[PDB]
Amino acid sequence: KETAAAKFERQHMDSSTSAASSSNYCNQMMKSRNLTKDRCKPVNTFVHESLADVQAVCSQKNVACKNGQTNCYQSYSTMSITDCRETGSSKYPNCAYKTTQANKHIIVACEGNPYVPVHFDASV
């Protein structure tokens, strides 16, 4: 069974120097990571930092989660990310995204023992 942590690695971790693909990063990645199985996930962020750097955010700046939980953590440093937002013409199962590369502070929900990232909440 997939842990909440393994799920966050599947949905969000793409440890890469920058962000690379053959055609359209978001179209390929949303499909290859099973984010277009049950539906086109409308928005999804991938983080191109090491797993260690991302896990470390759970000991960085404590902020409120978008849903009102207080177990969210903002990265002290900006991180190399890519945002995937479904296009207007996107129709399942042929999910179509606009790829937006950025360098921003990530906010993640941290949970468990050990205390590790389990949701991607926002970037600032």
Curated annotation (Swiss-Prot):
GO CC terms on record?
extracellular region
Which domain of life, per UniProt? Eukaryota
**Presence of keyword Oxidoreductase:** no
Q: Name one GO molecular function term.
A: RNA nuclease activity
- UniProt organism field: Bos taurus
**What is the name of the gene encoding this protein?**
RNASE1
**What family is this protein classified in?**
Belongs to the pancreatic ribonuclease family.
Any one Gene Ontology BP term = defense response to Gram-positive bacterium
Keywords annotated in UniProt? Disulfide bond, Endonuclease, Glycation, Glycoprotein, Hydrolase, Lyase, Nuclease, Secreted, Signal
Catalytic residues at 12, 119
Cite the record's note on assembly.
Interacts with and forms tight 1:1 complexes with RNH1. Dimerization of two such complexes may occur. Interaction with RNH1 inhibits this protein. Monomer.
User: Nucleus among the record's keywords?
Assistant: no
Primary residence: secreted
What protein is this chain from?
A: Ribonuclease pancreatic
Q: Which of this chain's residues are annotated to bind substrate? A: 7, 10, 41-45, 66, 85
Q: Which residues are glycosylated?
A: 1, 7, 34, 37, 41
Q: Disulfide bonds, which pairs?
A: 26-84, 40-95, 58-110, 65-72
Q: Where in the cell is it found?
A: Secreted
Q: What does this protein do?
A: Endonuclease that catalyzes the cleavage of RNA on the 3' side of pyrimidine nucleotides. Acts on single-stranded and double-stranded RNA.
Tissue expression summary: Pancreas.
This entry's Enzyme Commission designation comes to 4.6.1.18
